[PDB]
Symmetry: D2
Subunit: 250 residues, 4 copies
């Protein structure tokens, strides 16, 4: 039902599997500002989909929580890539349909997602979902000009907004129109710079809700304010969206 | 059940009423590029809401379909205003709760809506909805630089995007991310320039769908492509949104 | 959009029509214990469907409200029949698809519906819906042994439960499990005596709710207790059911 | 997140727990004709709820799969009882709200559920759900007069239909109107003999679908016929129902 698989020196990859087929899997990228891994965006999130009928690959990509040296922002893309690789070779055993692998991410964890959303091969996700994602370190986030800042002059490079082209996979993006950790602009501008390239996508923007809202269910929420029923609707919208994509495969 | 009320020299105002109370009414602004009145955004639209439990005031605001002279773009705001006025005085007879009047508009008909969405009094809509609205005559629409163009140098004035402030009522905006008549940018940029002013709103953006989609139901659609079930979901989202606002009025 | 058509000496037949095709029509049978016509089960109900994309034929079948003599319970079946007849001949003008005509009824109005649900010809409804229907004058209703009682020894004949066979069309039945006007047994036993004949159907039974609940919307409800959001869900279930049947054709 | 707890000589009790509170837990009773434990009604079912925000206690009650001797049909009630007991004492650690414990069961697993649905104490479930349950060994099931038949003359005693009174907790019952393993009559008659006792409940009956349908999702279904989207709606209806009860408890 579950077993972890070591990736690199610092990169866990939890793999959730069940059994009734070739269930379409989906890799998740929990947020946490590259610092850590927002727990309330992992296991809980996993179950959600695992219950919605999806093999889950929760990626614990390297972050500033294991002795940070260089901008592993590049080393990450590798880690996620390694996941697909893992599938590409263990797709028979994993009971996964290699032609039905998607990528998920929220907050910063999203940034990596959109990032990986280009320049790859038989590791390209047929689609991605970005929950209140981070479009660029130039969009209200990182809040502090100098924090997780470990150099690298080229900052415009770490703006996955520009890195969007016609080849970019279909995406689902939602965001609370009051998220103080990261302005909706992130998702907003991203959509604009996503439609102009005739990229099929769906977007949803809720009135209010704090950053890291996740499922907005009593499963993912510290206080009461983090438990929003109206916002929780996304996990449902996303379900329909995904499957709507599956059907449009052959 | 229904009876029209003459407004100005050129401005019909269809008023739909039913009876079980003080049902919250809602004024609609059918699109049609100020040229005419998109029929597939009127009566059908009316019923939708009238069925969802709302008194309907379909406004047939003056357009280039009755001998156009001057930019009545100002004379319109008056017309819609007259509607509220009509309610403000006939709210007891109309069985309408004056404290529960909302404004609806789509495509260009939306532009007027957002426009009226500021600078008024006891004629201020507790909320508005804008279906693939027109934010400004500078956002991909009017397609032709010179068509419905009847002068008036000051063009930036007819951009209801800037005309959005903290006083702007809560709004619901959706748009098909491929509408060729008017780019999603309209609603998109609008949202951005709507959130920054801490204005509570909800947004939805569908993958594909032609302009004037309306209800996306076999009630509002010329061909098959104009009949989209996934898009039709907005009229449902909108219902919940509205009522969510009503409850938030006690 | 609407125009009535005289049927018999005493039998109105309101016909609601709209225009974008050949929209599937649906005849309705408002309840009212054969005494009158529950208004809160007519016009409001009509719009509901008319909005859900269906031509509506509201039948004002003869009742004890126009000088009652004999048990017109037979004369009714005629009236409804006449409706189909009307369609069969004016199906081109009515813009109705003759192969997509359904029957609706609630409370007693339902009894007639199920009744007509057998022994006919090119007037057979491809499906019927029965809102808290009356299965027989022997199922807790009529409450009074002697009221609308105008003789006719053969009472078992007026039990449309037995009158159900394999030929009976697919039906949708819902009922509030506390309806004091008529026990759920009506719909309950009906389902049993509906499944045994391998008749495809769908049923729903809500916890609580008074008789005549109709849409349970602020459109159909005298007091607050008659406004139930959870119950209102049926009009939505019914929508999907119907259309699920439409698709289940050519 | 998960750990089993031995109950009796032959009775596993899988306990699924998560952590953000006092989440309302729910015990499940997987079906399998008392012979075994329908796998497709356990773990998958658990996740569903565990994702819907519920602590899950999957009960692996004794069955003819571990050397059957006597009609443990009585020994079962004990096993389930022990579960509540376990909670009643470990409700603080389990992070469970003892005043919010519900019972679930399907097919035969349901029979036990309804059964336990009376004659107990601080182990009474505030509500129960029964997916295509078994009302009595006299309702089309057991199919064979002599199979799991291990004596016990008193057969009418094993009919949990009669065992329903005003004290019986609110229940949610659904059933496919074509289930060949067990006729809908089970749930049908049960509803009748459930309403007459003014017991608040909700029912749903789908047109078609084989026995053991479970979630009707690609998570619980051997072939394609066992994957029904329309039927899968129950797990959603159930969610709302349950929570509707939580709110309406305090």
């Amino acid at each position: 039902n579950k077993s972890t698989f070591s990736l690199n020196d610092t990169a866990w990859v939890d793999f959730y599997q069940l059994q009734n087929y070739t269930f379409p899997a989906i890799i998740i990228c929990p947020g946490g500002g590259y610092q850590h891994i927002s727990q309330r965006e992992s296991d809980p999130l996993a179950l959600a989909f695992l219950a919605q009928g999806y093999q889950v690959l929760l990626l614990n990509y390297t972050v500033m929580n294991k002795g940070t040296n260089y901008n592993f922002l590049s080393q990450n893309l590798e880690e996620v890539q390694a996941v697909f690789s893992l599938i590409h070779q263990n797709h028979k055993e994993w009971q996964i349909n290699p032609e039905q692998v998607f990528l998920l991410g929220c907050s910063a964890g999203g940034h990596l997602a959109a990032w990986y959303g280009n320049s790859e091969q038989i590791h390209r996700p047929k689609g991605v979902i970005l929950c209140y994602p981070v479009t660029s370190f130039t969009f209200g986030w990182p809040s502090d000009l100098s924090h997780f800042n470990f150099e690298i002059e080229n900052i415009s490079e770490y703006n996955i907004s520009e890195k969007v082209t016609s080849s970019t996979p279909p995406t689902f993006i939602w965001h609370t129109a009051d998220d103080e950790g990261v302005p909706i602009y992130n998702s907003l501008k991203y959509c604009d710079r996503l439609s102009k390239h005739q990229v099929p996508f769906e977007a949803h923007f809720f009135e209010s809700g704090p950053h890291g809202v996740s499922l907005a269910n009593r499963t993912t929420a510290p206080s009461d304010a983090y438990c929003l029923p109206s916002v929780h609707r996304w996990v449902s919208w996303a379900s329909d969206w995904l499957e709507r994509q599956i059907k449009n495969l052959e």
